[PDB]
């Protein structure tokens, strides 16, 4: 009887809420009130990268903390040496509307995808000298929204097809398919241990997925609108989210509920990108305002602002070494920011 | 700069040269987004001129046109339509052979028109499949007033000069469809977007010229605003 199944679903959801409430013995603001404030972060534009012809959608850092990959709707992946601003590669893409780019942790490959519904893996270290398409990965009744490398052979992808997929790059086949969402999946974040990853979707829910088991371990539902961005906290026990509603939220996997909410009434525009600093004390978000804002991840106070963009920030990646914050915008520029002193 | 850094900078400069050489082309090309239900002859128009997106290219009077048709993507358009915030026009094709389909087409036109991100993109509105509309309204087996009751009182505006050889009944029906879309066009937007209704059929060879003239006008209005004339 379908009616009893949906009533059981309602009772299970109420049990979930009851358990989460029982675990809410305190709140992050109450616990962290005593911690010294971060103070005004005055990050300054150290580098401006002016190569792209059109809007920059995504960028990602190489593990070396020096090289960038940057995607623009002109159909170009430009690999930037951030220290010298030199362009290491310009990769012409067979599809122009590219929404995501990824840099392999080894630096050998970069992935990109978009409205072509294909995740194209490019080999940067060929003997022939030119960057070539190593493989094209294609199954999705939807645009590819975010791709992230687990290793040189495995790449997770998310699409408007309401699904995420783990691809075996050598064979070009989906090893596992993650299907628990109901809207478009817009962002992925791999846990530091690469065993789990969290996907935000337009269904206003962020789901944690076990990469090996292929099952949704938990679902988080605090937001009111599309979760445009998601980023794991550096220890893998929490992850931040950003939504069209101008609120970021910090979720803890162990507590299975919101720990903090980051919103200020002067902000009425949706989060486009979210990433933590190395220590996790700073949460950085792009907004469409057009500036970025730095949030004290524990005190929730707005610690600073990065103003230098002429159009909406679309991407925001903190270097693995923690030494710089890249910010791409539809103005076709990437700005690399670092501390004042 | 060491010997290697100088050569790296030379490579960067050559890449910049390529980026400028293809920036010229990118800025000379006019980008178009083609939308419409499966009932609408997007495929016929493109045949007369990456499963997710099809980039058709065509050229009129040495001006390059890129036409993107978004295919195997879920119908919750809200998200990916952000990308096309910077296109010369949206080519919206609707099947004019009247049925319940046409009200859904009107609602889709509304959603495209009032989208926050398309707030400044003109819509070239191809009321396609006019041959079938003429045949259907001449046969009379199904009549537009069955679905849009306001047609019982609608009478042909005098200012709309009829095409030669077309029956007044066909003219009235097609003008009513045109007006029903134009009303959605005018109800919102302070002139930042304009709809350009065009009647067309599968055999029509003129569509590329129509898009050329419409992009002409759209770029002219963009220039007038940008150069402060208006």
């Amino acid at each position, epitope marked *: 009887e379908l009616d009893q199944l949906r009533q059981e679903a309602e009772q299970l959801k109420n049990q979930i809420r009851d358990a989460r409430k029982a675990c809410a013995d305190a709140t992050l603001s109450q616990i962290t009130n005593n911690i010294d404030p971060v103070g005004r972060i005055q990050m300054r534009t150290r580098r401006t990268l002016r190569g792209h012809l059109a809007k920059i959608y995504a960028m990602h850092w190489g593990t070396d903390s020096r090289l960038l990959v940057s995607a623009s709707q002109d159909g170009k992946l430009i690999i930037w040496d951030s220290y010298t601003t030199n362009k290491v*590669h310009a990769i012409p893409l067979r599809s122009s509307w590219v929404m995501t780019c990824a840099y392999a942790p080894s*630096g050998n490959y970069v992935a990109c995808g978009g409205l072509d519904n294909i995740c194209s893996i490019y080999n940067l270290k060929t003997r022939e000298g030119n960057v070539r398409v190593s493989r094209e990965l294609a199954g999705h009744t939807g645009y590819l929204s975010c791709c992230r490398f687990l290793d040189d052979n495995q790449i997770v992808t998310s699409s408007g097809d309401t699904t995420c997929a783990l691809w075996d790059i050598e064979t070009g086949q989906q090893t596992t398919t993650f299907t628990g969402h109901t809207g478009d999946v817009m962002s992925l974040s791999l846990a530091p241990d690469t065993r789990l990853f969290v996907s935000g979707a337009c269904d206003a829910s962020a789901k944690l997925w076990d990469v090996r088991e292929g099952m949704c371990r938990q679902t988080f539902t605090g937001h009111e609108s599309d979760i445009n961005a998601i980023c794991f906290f550096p220890n893998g026990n929490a992850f931040a989210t950003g939504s069209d509603d101008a609120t970021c939220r910090l979720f803890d996997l162990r507590a299975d509920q919101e720990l903090m909410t980051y919103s200020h009434d002067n902000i009425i525009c949706g989060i486009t990108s979210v990433s933590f600093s190395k220590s996790g004390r700073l949460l950085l978000a792009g907004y469409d305002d057009f500036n970025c804002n730095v949030w004290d991840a524990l005190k929730a106070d707005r610690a600073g602002v990065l103003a230098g963009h002429d159009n909406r920030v679309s991407c925001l990646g903190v270097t693995d070494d923690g030494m710089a914050v890249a910010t791409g915008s539809w103005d076709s520029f990437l700005k690399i920011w670092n501390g004042s002193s | 700069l060491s010997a290697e850094d100088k050569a790296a900078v*030379e*490579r960067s400069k*050559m890449i910049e040269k390529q980026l400028q050489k293809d920036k010229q082309v990118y800025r000379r090309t006019l980008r178009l987004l083609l939308l419409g239900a499966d009932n609408s002859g997007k495929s016929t128009i493109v045949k007369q001129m990456t499963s997710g997106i099809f980039e058709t290219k065509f050229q009129v009077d040495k001006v390059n046109f890129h036409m993107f048709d978004v295919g195997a993507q879920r119908d919750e358009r809200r998200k990916w339509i952000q990308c096309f915030n910077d296109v010369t026009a949206i080519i919206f094709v609707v099947d004019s052979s009247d049925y319940n389909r046409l009200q859904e087409a009107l609602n889709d036109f509304k959603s495209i028109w009032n989208n926050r991100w398309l707030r400044t993109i003109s819509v070239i509105l191809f009321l396609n499949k006019q041959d079938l509309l003429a045949e259907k309204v001449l046969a009379g087996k199904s009549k537009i007033e069955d679905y849009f009751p306001e047609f019982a009182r609608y009478t042909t505006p005098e200012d709309a000069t009829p095409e030669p050889g077309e029956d007044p009944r066909v003219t009235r029906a097609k003008y009513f469809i045109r007006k029903e879309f134009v009303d959605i066009s005018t109800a919102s937007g302070d002139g930042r977007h304009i709809c350009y209704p065009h009647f067309t059929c599968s055999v029509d060879t003129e569509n590329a010229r129509r898009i050329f003239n419409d992009c002409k006008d759209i770029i002219l209005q963009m220039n007038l605003r940008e150069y402060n004339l208006v």
Partner: single-chain antibody
Amino acid sequence: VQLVESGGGLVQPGGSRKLSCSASGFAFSSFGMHWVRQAPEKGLEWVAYISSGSGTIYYADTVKGRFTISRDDPKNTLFLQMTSLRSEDTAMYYCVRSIYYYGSSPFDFWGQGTTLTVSSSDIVMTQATSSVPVTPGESVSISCRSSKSLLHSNGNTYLYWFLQRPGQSPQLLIYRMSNLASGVPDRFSGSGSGTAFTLTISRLEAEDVGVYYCMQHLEYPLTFGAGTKLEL
């Protein structure tokens, strides 16, 4: 990937000759090209350089004016035209591939060569010994001492190591100290202080027999060492 040189032969002194090299199997346009000569039973010597897009050209002081280097990208052919040959120019001329960007491996491919017979501020690279006897399975060490500290302010130490086996073109082993290109990583390694450098072979094999050449890539007059020949 092939670089096949053409030309060579015998030339009377004062004549002109036109070496050419055909590139196949790689994006020739994106690669900078070098000419490196080897006089009979002597060491390698740098000749000329032409960058991608022909934007930059350099010559050895012993070659300026006399030889001109040019490239025809659409025909995938490199050229070297010699205006007034001398007995000192008798050597096997190798076409050498180079590509320059962060993490690139310059001098990664060497053509087979063309034998041409004719009827300062430069960084002196000194190699400790001309020869070193060794047997398979032994750990080995080859050392080089530059006349100038190659450790640039950028942190890179622009020192290169090449192996030339009998009858083969030089093969790039280590392109910047501790960076291994064609490596057998369990065997080859390299380190240096920025003025003294050493290449270590952890377990020598029969394939390691050959002359090991050090090269610097900090200043354009590119100076190779005299080479250390390992014998077994």
